[PDB]
Amino acid sequence: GVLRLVMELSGEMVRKCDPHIGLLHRGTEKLIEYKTYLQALPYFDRLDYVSMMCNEQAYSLAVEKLLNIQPPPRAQWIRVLFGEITRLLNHIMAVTTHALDIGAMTPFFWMFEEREKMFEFYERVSGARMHAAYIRPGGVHQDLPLGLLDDIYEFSKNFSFRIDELEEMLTNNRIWRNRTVDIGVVTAEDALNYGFSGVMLRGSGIQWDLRKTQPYDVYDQVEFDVPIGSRGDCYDRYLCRVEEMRQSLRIISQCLNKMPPGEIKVDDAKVSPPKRAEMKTSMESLIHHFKLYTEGYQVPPGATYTAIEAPKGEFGVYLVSDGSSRPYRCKIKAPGFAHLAGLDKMSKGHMLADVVAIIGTQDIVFGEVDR
Amino acid sequence: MFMINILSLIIPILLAVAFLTLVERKVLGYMQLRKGPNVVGPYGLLQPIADALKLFTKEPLRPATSSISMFIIAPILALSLALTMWVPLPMPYPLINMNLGVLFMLAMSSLAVYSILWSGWASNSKYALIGALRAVAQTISYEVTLAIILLSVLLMNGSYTLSTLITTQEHIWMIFTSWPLAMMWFISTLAETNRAPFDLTEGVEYAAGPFAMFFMAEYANIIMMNAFTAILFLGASHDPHTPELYTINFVLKTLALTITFLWIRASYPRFRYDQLMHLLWKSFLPLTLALCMWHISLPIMTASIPPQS
Amino acid sequence: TYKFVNMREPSMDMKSVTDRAAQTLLWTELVRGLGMTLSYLFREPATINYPFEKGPLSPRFRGEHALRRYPSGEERCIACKLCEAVCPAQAITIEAEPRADGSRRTTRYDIDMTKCIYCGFCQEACPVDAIVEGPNFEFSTETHEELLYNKEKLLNNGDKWEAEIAANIQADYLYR
Amino acid sequence: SRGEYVVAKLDDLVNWARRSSLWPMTFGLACCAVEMMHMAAPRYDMDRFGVVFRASPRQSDVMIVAGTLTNKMAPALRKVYDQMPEPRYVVSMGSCANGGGYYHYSYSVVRGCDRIVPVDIYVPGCPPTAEALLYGILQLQRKIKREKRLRIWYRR
Amino acid sequence: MWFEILPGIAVMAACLFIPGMATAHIHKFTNGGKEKRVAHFSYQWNLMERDRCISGVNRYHVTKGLENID
Amino acid sequence: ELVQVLRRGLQQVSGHGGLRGYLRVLFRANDVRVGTLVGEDKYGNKYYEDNKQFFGRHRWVIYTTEMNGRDTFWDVDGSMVPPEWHRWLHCMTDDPPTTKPPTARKYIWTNHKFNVSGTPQQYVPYSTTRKKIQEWVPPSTPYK
Amino acid sequence: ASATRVIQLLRNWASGRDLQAKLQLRYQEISKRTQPPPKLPVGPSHKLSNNYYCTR
Ligand SMILES: CCCCCCCCCCCCCCCCCC(=O)OC[C@H](COP(=O)([O-])OCC[N+](C)(C)C)OC(=O)CCCCCCCCCCCCCCCCC
Ligand SMILES: CCCCCCCCCCCCCCCCCC(=O)OC[C@H](COP(=O)([O-])OCC[N+](C)(C)C)OC(=O)CCCCCCCCCCCCCCCCC
Ligand SMILES: CCCCCCCCCCCCCCCCCC(=O)OC[C@H](COP(=O)([O-])OCC[N+](C)(C)C)OC(=O)CCCCCCCCCCCCCCCCC
Ligand SMILES: CCCCCCCCCCCCCCCCC[C@@H](O)O[C@H](CO[C@H](O)CCCCCCCCCCCCCCC)COP(=O)(O)OCC[N+](C)(C)C
Ligand SMILES: CCCCCCCCCCCCCCCCC[C@@H](O)O[C@H](CO[C@H](O)CCCCCCCCCCCCCCC)COP(=O)(O)OCC[N+](C)(C)C
Ligand SMILES: CCCCCCCC/C=C/CCCCCCCC(=O)OC[C@H](COP(=O)(O)OCCN)OC(=O)CCCCCCC/C=C/CCCCCCCC
Ligand SMILES: CCCCCCCC/C=C/CCCCCCCC(=O)OC[C@H](COP(=O)(O)OCCN)OC(=O)CCCCCCC/C=C/CCCCCCCC
Ligand SMILES: CC(C)NC(=N)NC(=N)Nc1ccc(Cl)cc1
Ligand SMILES: CC(C)NC(=N)NC(=N)Nc1ccc(Cl)cc1
Ligand code: SF4
Ligand code: SF4
Ligand code: SF4
């Protein structure tokens, strides 16, 4: 709804595409420069608003790498589980909105009921249905409420049937195959060099995935498969997304089985706020709470670039700290920026409906594109 | 009494169009796991009235750079031709019994094509004009296919009389006889009415009252197409002493076909323009010609030529 | 590990060719899609009857802000301005002076609800649990001004929702 | 008076149609648009209230500004608002639409869509719950129920 | 549930019942309780004209027979 | 069977107190389901529970026909419920206020109020602080 | 759920899978909205001795 596209056509073909991004630019990086490290978390929460907890996790990983601290194992497992839940949310949104643009809406409504249930999980764990601000540098804000894992298990039980119902309407449909097959074909070298990451690379056939090549949190303790495309088109990307949903279900099952006990934030009151009882009974805890919530913890001077495998590709944060309690520089690399830059390459020799399909398969969020 | 018959043919059609809008919304909701309008009235039986009242008491936006003559004529022509195609339909007795009723339907549809072109050319906007041109091309192609199919079907009827169609279908169903023609006829009617998966135009300049005229014309055309298909391929038994049985059966079949239209719209994605154009000229037209040849040859080779009278 | 999603050559034997030709001529997958949609039609809808039925919530839900009091009736806020320090959106404006009895109490406490992002940082930073996010979420207004709450409005909200807010805090204060 | 009674009844009839049949144009600019999709989802089903899922600007009566309105986007919003035919209403959903939200002090953000278009209903939240947006829509409906156009006209 | 769609379908069926039933009733009313004559050909039209002439009340549906000839 | 469903519908008709009650609950609530009564507040709202329904439809409220000074026979809001029944209805707990009464305080409102936007009782903001700088008042006695 | 037996057979045949096992609606299988109070554990640094911050 915030996309302006200038297209030069030759009768029916599309000879030139020019995306005029910038309709959702808000100066997020400068605002982050003016905020502190804790006050900048919701900014990442609002960058890619289908992968909110994934963006929170990326920012938390960057800040923790700068601080040279380590989250507890239970916090890491919770972060991985909710990252997989958010990946399910994002893939559902992408596939359903792609179909909604190309015709079909009933899978949109079904999978959005499923999204409503996952938002109920989000609200139970955080209190906010969309922008949890739950994953923070040093762990997570609060422990899981009792009985949440049982509901997550029930949802995981009753989701493969939903995926199968979605596939019954689109996978073998000849209309869907006509709309998606051999459209937006991109070679492996061109995809890379234009700067592609994630689903685009997997569809083009490149065996690359950050969760397996550069593991973070406890992603190296779970078993899952990486879908690989063969023709590098919209249909292959759709199949890859569906298989990624199934693999994320498997990872969720593993996390539910192997959730460990312990604390949920780093036991370092100079970084993570102390508990309320300790703050109300201990002078050191009160001082640390006061300082953390007024000035904020200082981060040693340096510069880091941390990237994670967000559901839309490689999401990266380049954080530059000058030793103060506020970040000096914060560059946000969103996967959709390079994809929308490469939209013109993929739209050659196609039509308007093909351009719509290419945008849908690129799965562009203009919030993260513009920042 | 003839004016009374005309009004009894006209007004219930408009009421059925409004409640068809309501039924379509509810059926789409229940297929999409929603509920549909159930708030405005008891089980939602006031939504068409509310929509009609709002559209009537809504401000129009007639463009300054527009031909007022065409801008007024196009909805009038569309609605008049939508209402006209109900007078030769027998249920079981047509209002106007014509010796050649089918050709009247074909001519009325061919004239009804003009409304899209005139509405597109009235707005004096390039993009709406291009959309209208694409719609015209799609409609004329599927008109060719519909004409060939309808010619093929009537070779087992013996004439262009729908009463003779009923008499022919007294025993068994033309859908049993010629089901591939039924498939192609149903798809071509979908494409002609521009319902999904062929709603390329809606996938704009008119608003408020004149928009409602086009909406009513389109839905009346949909109902008329379903009724014609039910008569042509799903012929019911007619008893001269109790005609109401045939009327009930025909109405049930028409409702089933319209509900199938809504079902297909809910179920399927949208075709691309060139894809649906290649669907006809390269997949439907050759099969239509082959089946036309087969249905010409069949009565001669089986000594089953229908009577002219 | 990895897997292939669309690398599977169909067999070219006469049986498979005839099956694929029948699928092309007879719309088998389209009939399958119709059947799935019909099944969903005959399923039960998942719609709640709002406003007579409400969607499930949690004690951690963040909604309209409120200022609490002690059981003795004295207001909990001590004018410490950790609110203003930690608010990401700078939606809280606090001005304080000694009270007539010498207490450290606020004289101005304004929250711009059109600027707040409902992030819940203010109730985490309160050492006395004065400012809270109440469970109310149906406080839509017909003017921009009505969303500029002040101390009187916040105290009225706290008095109005004190029972539910106290119950939620009692239920979810062990996780904090 | 018979004339007063007739104009009151006609006003009640006309307001009932507009209240019951709402065709909103969703200006989904940012994360607040997702909650609108969840309101249109099966659980809440905005369609059952007579609120159509989506409509074109020409056939729309309500504009739901849901998202951050930027300087590069404000002219388009004003253009579509002008193109909407009267009677027209505006619902500003979320902090970004209401005021500035998290981006109030940004150089490239319009601090409130009320600086561009007259807003009828303000829905607070970030993002507002689907129930909150539904409550705002019902409040707009009840506000339409209080319109007295014919009563004002008859007393001119 | 799914049976809430029936009232709308019921109203549609009631509306679509009116045309055919009204046409049949008017045809039987304007022809003395008999189906309207279908004059698809000049022979049938001549038969109708002869019937009207022999009736003499200027109504083709007023049929005469053996009691009329003798 | 269909007969069982028809009998259930007739029982629902009889469960609301005849025909007038059934029509009233159909037209002002758009639902004719019957459930066990849990309790009633001081304003007239009646809260019903039916655990056989799926989650989200197992608890509901029938609003009163008149709350405070406003006629609410047709115009019913979600803000008309008191906070305790609000918590119960939104399912933050499994304990109705009748079973678990809220703690009583001398400052808690005894009368609940709904959203008063668009009404003369609407909230109007104002500055709650005194003037910062006091001006100098000239003397009231002429110098010459 | 509460559907009739014929309706259940029709929906199972049309979909091709047994839908009674996998229901989109939650029927009392979810956790209670009221849970017993928890007792969260402490971290590794909650030690009264040999816990100097200069070593961690
Ligand atoms: C905007 C474009 C407008 C284009 C048209 C403008 C001019 C209209 C001229 C109307 C001429 C009418 C001719 C018929 C006169 C009566 C002849 C007769 O009795 O025929 C018996 C025949 C009987 O049918 P039959 O063929 O079965 O006859 C054999 C059977 N016997 C002999 C027993 C009767 O009637 C017909 O053929 C009916 C079809 C008439 C077709 C011509 C009229 C078309 C009207 C629709 C088009 C115009 C719509 C305009 C809408 C508004 C636009 C702003
Ligand atoms: C939205 C989901 C739709 C699911 C499918 C619904 C239609 C079921 C038929 C198969 C799928 C559609 C195929 C195309 C259309 C086929 C038409 C067809 O065969 O129709 C069958 C019957 C009519 O066929 P019939 O069997 O009655 O006719 C006999 C015909 N002869 C004598 C020539 C052999 O129509 C219907 O079932 C209508 C279905 C649509 C309307 C639904 C609401 C009414 C429900 C039944 C009410 C019964 C009492 C009515 C009043 C009686 C008074 C005495
Ligand atoms: C098949 C049916 C098709 C048609 C269906 C629709 C028609 C039937 C329902 C119509 C309902 C009425 C709608 C009218 C429009 C109302 C809203 C509107 O446009 O308001 C804007 C205006 C408001 O006027 P205004 O001048 O105050 O406008 C404000 C200023 N501007 C223009 C800047 C906005 O409405 C009118 O001007 C309408 C007034 C005339 C209508 C009749 C009102 C009086 C009726 C009673 C008369 C006396 C009776 C007793 C004595 C009798 C003696 C003989
Ligand atoms: C063939 C076409 C038929 C179309 C309609 C078919 C379906 C009709 C269904 C109608 C069911 C009855 C609806 C009743 C709604 C509630 C009526 C009432 O609430 O509204 C009153 C005013 O509403 C109207 O007077 C009632 C209209 C009922 C419907 C009339 C028939 C529908 C019009 C048909 C037009 C067909 C042409 C349009 C086709 C598109 C205001 O009363 P109120 O102020 O609260 O008094 C206090 C309430 N007390 C008494 C209980 C304390
Ligand atoms: C094709 C064009 C069609 C023309 C049709 C013309 C015929 C007029 C149309 C009549 C339609 C039916 C009348 C309106 C139905 C009212 C339904 C009633 O229930 O509404 C009530 C509203 O009543 C109001 O007081 C207005 C009554 C409606 C207007 C009635 C006017 C009197 C009848 C028409 C007289 C026309 C003028 C005659 C002058 C001599 C309460 O509903 P609501 O507001 O949602 O609040 C409940 C909200 N819930 C559901 C969530 C609980
Ligand atoms: C993305 C596609 C969008 C681009 C294409 C959209 C084209 C829209 C062009 C917008 C220009 C507006 C004029 C075109 C529509 C004219 C509609 C109209 O005539 O409405 C008249 C009617 C007048 O009032 P009444 O209802 O008759 O009396 C009661 C008063 N309350 O409505 C109005 O209030 C409109 C009056 C002022 C609007 C016109 C002001 C702008 C005119 C400048 C010229 C622009 C022309 C556009 C040229 C298009 C090609 C470049
Ligand atoms: C009225 C009853 C309703 C009951 C049915 C319920 C509704 C079912 C409708 C669902 C259909 C969904 C909408 C369909 C839209 C798209 C249709 C479609 O795609 O068909 C095109 C299809 C394939 O196109 P593509 O694969 O894309 O082209 C690539 C070529 N290699 O082509 C077609 O023409 C379809 C075939 C139609 C005719 C079938 C005839 C079968 C052969 C007949 C043999 C018998 C000959 C008779 C002689 C007998 C001698 C003894
Ligand atoms: C920025 C991302 C998260 N949001 C979406 N608006 N994707 C999109 N294609 N969704 C959508 C929803 C409704 C309609 Cl009518 C058309 C498209
Ligand atoms: C496809 C969408 C825009 N349409 C609708 N949900 N209802 C509709 N256009 N309104 C309407 C209802 C009745 C009549 Cl007679 C004329 C118009
Ligand atoms: S919830 Fe967050 S943005 Fe809102 S007032 Fe509290 S600290 Fe500020
Ligand atoms: S944190 Fe608490 S005590 Fe401090 S200013 Fe805010 S409400 Fe008052
Ligand atoms: S108010 Fe919050 S959720 Fe809505 S657009 Fe702004 S940042 Fe996104």
DSSP string of A80-94, one letter each residue? HHHHHHHHHHHHHHH
- Distance, in Å, from the CA atom of D84 to the CA atom of B57, rounded to the nearest integer, reads 15
What dihedral angle (degrees, nearest 10) is formed by the CA atoms of C129, C132, C135, C136? 140
Q: From residue B36, how far is each of B32, B171, B201 by CA, in Å?
A: 10, 40, 25
> Cβ contacts (< 8 Å) between B269 and chain A: which residues?
99, 102-104, 170, 173, 175-176, 179
Asked if residue C122 belongs to a known ligand binding site, the reply is yes
**Secondary structure of chain D: what % helix, strand, coil (to 5)?**
50, 15, 35
What dihedral angle (degrees, nearest 10) is formed by the CA atoms of B271, B276, B282, B288? 110
Question: C119: which 2 tokens?
Answer: 């992030």
Asked if residue D96 belongs to a known ligand binding site, the reply is yes
Opening angle at CA D57, ends D56 and D63, nearest 5: 110
Question: B153: which 2 tokens?
Answer: 């079907």
Nearest CA to ligand 8 atom 15: D54
Q: Which amino acid is at A365?
A: V
- Distance, in Å, from the CA atom of C57 to the CA atom of F90, rounded to the nearest integer, reads 6
Is the CB–ligand 11 distance for residue C96 below 6 Å?
no
D131, D139, D147: best to mutate for the F interface, most F CBs within 10 A? D139
Opening angle at CA A130, ends A127 and A134, nearest 5: 55
Question: A184: which 2 tokens?
Answer: 């937006």
- The phi and psi torsions of B227 (rounded to 5 degrees) equal -65, -40
- Distance, in Å, from the CA atom of A256 to the CA atom of B166, rounded to the nearest integer, reads 66
- The phi and psi torsions of A298 (rounded to 5 degrees) equal -85, 145
Buried-exposed string F31-41: b where 16+ CB fall within 10 A, e elsewhere:
eebbbeebbeb
- Distance, in Å, from the CA atom of B299 to the CA atom of B308, rounded to the nearest integer, reads 13
Omega cis (within 30) before B42: no
Q: Answer whether A331's CB lies under 8 Å from A29's CB.
A: yes
Residue of D67, B287, A151 whose CA lies nearest to C26: B287
Question: G34: which 2 tokens?
Answer: 């009221």
**Parallel, antiparallel or unpaired: strands A313-321 and A329-333:** antiparallel
The partner residues of D89 in beta bridges, in order of sequence, read D62
> Cβ contacts (< 8 Å) between F2 and chain G: which residues?
4
Q: Answer whether B118's CB lies under 8 Å from B258's CB.
A: no
- Under an 8 A CB cutoff, do E19 and B38 touch? no
- Distance, in Å, from the CA atom of A351 to the CA atom of B1, rounded to the nearest integer, reads 56
- Distance, in Å, from the CA atom of A192 to the CA atom of B276, rounded to the nearest integer, reads 35
Is the CB–ligand 2 distance for residue C31 below 6 Å?
no
Q: From residue G16, how far is each of A162, B33, B129, C19, C35 by CA, in Å?
A: 13, 18, 46, 20, 8
- Distance, in Å, from the CA atom of D38 to the CA atom of A111, rounded to the nearest integer, reads 11
- Which helix (H) or strand (E) segment holds residue D80: the answer is helix D74-83
Q: From residue E41, how far is each of B309, D5, E37, E48, E54 by CA, in Å?
A: 9, 62, 11, 11, 20
Q: From residue A314, how far is each of A44, A305, D103 by CA, in Å?
A: 15, 12, 26
Nearest CA to ligand 10 atom 6: C122
* DSSP assignment letter at D31: T
- Under an 8 A CB cutoff, do A353 and B272 touch? yes
Residue of A239, A245, A266 whose CA lies nearest to A137: A266
Residue of B221, B9, B226 whose CA lies nearest to E18: B9
- Distance, in Å, from the CA atom of A343 to the CA atom of A339, rounded to the nearest integer, reads 6
CA F106 vs. chain centroid, Å, equals 22
Nearest CA in chain B to D55: B204
- Distance, in Å, from the CA atom of G56 to the CA atom of G45, rounded to the nearest integer, reads 9
Angle between helices B285-302 and B179-193 (to 10 degrees): 140
Q: What is the CATH number of the domain that holds D139?
A: 3.40.50.12280
- Under an 8 A CB cutoff, do D102 and A31 touch? yes
Task: Locate the ligand 10 atom nearest the alpha carbon of residue C131 and give its number.
Answer: 6
Is the CB–ligand 9 distance for residue B284 below 6 Å?
no
SS (H, E, C) B185-221: HHHHHHHHHCCCCCCCCCCCCCCCHHHHHHHHHHHHH
**Would you say how long chain A is, in residues?**
371
Nearest CA to ligand 12 atom 6: D96
- Report the 10 Å Cβ neighbour count for B225: 26
Give the nearest partner residue to C47 out of B34, B266, B268, using CB atoms.
Answer: B34
Q: From residue F20, how far is each of E70, F25, F40, F64, F137 by CA, in Å?
A: 70, 9, 21, 16, 73
Task: Locate the ligand 11 atom nearest the alpha carbon of residue C81 and give its number.
Answer: 5
**Parallel, antiparallel or unpaired: strands A226-228 and C2-4:** parallel
Mutate to test the pocket of ligand 8, among A101, A358, A362 (most ligand atoms within 8 A of CB): A101
Q: What is the CATH number of the domain that holds C103?
A: 3.30.70.3270
Residue of A66, C117, C104 whose CA lies nearest to D99: C117
User: What resolution (Å)?
Assistant: 3.1
Task: Locate the ligand 12 atom nearest the alpha carbon of residue D31 and give its number.
Answer: 8
With H, G, I as helix, E, B as strand and everything else as coil, classify residue A139. Answer: strand
Question: C128: which 2 tokens?
Answer: 């006395």
Residue of G31, G22, G28, G27 whose CA lies nearest to G1: G27
Neighbouring residues of A337: CB distance < 8 A, sequence distance ≥ 6: A368, A369
- Distance, in Å, from the CA atom of B101 to the CA atom of F76, rounded to the nearest integer, reads 56
- Distance, in Å, from the CA atom of B231 to the CA atom of G26, rounded to the nearest integer, reads 46
Angle between helices B114-122 and B126-154 (to 10 degrees): 180
- Report the 10 Å Cβ neighbour count for C51: 21
Residues of B within an 8 Å Cβ radius of D: 25, 29, 32-40, 44, 46-47, 49-51, 53-54, 57-61, 204-208, 211
- Distance, in Å, from the CA atom of A249 to the CA atom of A272, rounded to the nearest integer, reads 31
Q: Is the dihedral of CA C162, C166, C167, C169 positive or negative?
A: positive
Mutate to test the pocket of ligand 12, among D27, D32, D70, D102 (most ligand atoms within 8 A of CB): D32
- Closest ligand to A50 CA? 8
Range of the domain at D102: 2-155
- Under an 8 A CB cutoff, do B33 and C46 touch? yes
Question: F50: which 2 tokens?
Answer: 């039916």
Mutate to test the pocket of ligand 8, among A45, A86, A100 (most ligand atoms within 8 A of CB): A100
Biggest CA–CA distance in chain E, Å, is 70
Q: Is the dihedral of CA D56, D62, D68, D73 positive or negative?
A: positive
Strands (E), chain D: 24-28, 62-66, 89-93, 121-123
- Distance, in Å, from the CA atom of C123 to the CA atom of C133, rounded to the nearest integer, reads 7
Q: Which amino acid is at D92?
A: S
Q: Answer whether F67's CB lies under 8 Å from F46's CB.
A: no
- Distance, in Å, from the CA atom of B189 to the CA atom of B230, rounded to the nearest integer, reads 12
E vs D contact (3+ beta-carbon pairs below 8 A)? no
Question: D120: which 2 tokens?
Answer: 């009828």
What dihedral angle (degrees, nearest 10) is formed by the CA atoms of C98, C99, C102, C106? -60
Q: From residue B33, how far is each of A161, B72, C115 by CA, in Å?
A: 15, 40, 37
Give the nearest partner residue to E38 out of B1, B13, B97, using CB atoms.
Answer: B97
- Report the 10 Å Cβ neighbour count for A255: 24
B25, B27, B32: best to mutate for the A interface, most A CBs within 10 A? B32
Ligand 4 center–CA D13 separation, angstroms: 11
- The phi and psi torsions of D27 (rounded to 5 degrees) equal -95, 75
Question: A43: which 2 tokens?
Answer: 């900014």
Residues of A within an 8 Å Cβ radius of D: 1-2, 22-28, 30-31, 42-43, 46, 49-50, 93, 109-110, 112-113, 115-116, 119, 129-131, 367
The partner residues of A140 in beta bridges, in order of sequence, read A135
Residue C35 touches chain G, beta carbons under 8 Å: yes
- Under an 8 A CB cutoff, do B269 and A106 touch? no
- Distance, in Å, from the CA atom of B80 to the CA atom of D143, rounded to the nearest integer, reads 39
Nearest CA to ligand 11 atom 1: C126
Neighbouring residues of B283: CB distance < 8 A, sequence distance ≥ 6: none
**Parallel, antiparallel or unpaired: strands D62-66 and D89-93:** parallel
* Residue for token pair 């007639």: B62
> Cβ contacts (< 8 Å) between C45 and chain B: which residues?
29-30, 33-35
DSSP string of chain B, one letter each residue? -HHHHHHHHHHHHHHHHHHHHHHHHHHHHHHTT---S-SSSGGGTTHHHHHHHHHHTS-----SSS-HHHHHHHHHHHHHHHHHTTSS--SSS-SS--SSHHHHHHHHHHHHTHHHHHHHHHTT-HHHHHHHHHHHHHHHHHHHHHHHHHHHHHTTTSSS-HHHHHHHTTSS-HHHH-HHHHHHHHHHHHHHHT-TTS-TTT-----SHHHHHHHHHHHHHHHHHHHHHHHHHSPPP--TT-THHHHHHHHHHHHHHHHHHHHHHHH-----HHHHHHHIIIIIHHHHHHHHHHHHHHHHHHT-PPP--
E vs A contact (3+ beta-carbon pairs below 8 A)? no
SS (H, E, C) chain C: CEEECCCCCCCCCHHHHHHHHHHHHCCHHHHHHHHHHHHHHHCCCCCCCCCCCCCCCCCCCCCCEEECECCCCCECCCCCCHHHHHCCCCCEEEEEEECCCCCEEEEEEEEECCCCCCCCHHHHCCCCCCEEECCCCCCCECCCHHHEECHHHHHHHHHHCHHHHHHHHHHHCCCC
Q: How far is C47 from chain B (nearest CA, A)?
A: 6
Instruction: Count up the domains in chain D and report the number.
Output: 1
Nearest CA to ligand 8 atom 11: A97
Task: Locate the ligand 7 atom nearest the alpha carbon of residue B186 and give its number.
Answer: 1
F6, F49, F55: best to mutate for the G interface, most G CBs within 10 A? F55
- Which helix (H) or strand (E) segment holds residue F46: the answer is strand F46-49
* DSSP assignment letter at A16: E
- Closest ligand to B66 CA? 6
Nearest CA to ligand 5 atom 11: B49
Is the CB–ligand 2 distance for residue B22 below 6 Å?
no
Is the CB–ligand 2 distance for residue C38 below 6 Å?
yes
Ligand 8 center–CA A130 separation, angstroms: 16
Q: From residue B74, how far is each of A201, F17, F76 by CA, in Å?
A: 52, 55, 45
Neighbouring residues of F111: CB distance < 8 A, sequence distance ≥ 6: F68
- Determination technique for this PDB entry? cryo-EM
The partner residues of C69 in beta bridges, in order of sequence, read C75
Q: Answer whether B205's CB lies under 8 Å from B123's CB.
A: yes
- Distance, in Å, from the CA atom of D140 to the CA atom of D120, rounded to the nearest integer, reads 8
Q: Which amino acid is at B174?
A: M
Q: How far is G33 from chain F (nearest CA, A)?
A: 5
Q: How many CA atoms lie within 13 A of A32 on its CB side?
A: 26
Range of the domain at C71: 64-175
Q: Answer whether A150's CB lies under 8 Å from G31's CB.
A: yes
Q: Answer whether A236's CB lies under 8 Å from A180's CB.
A: no
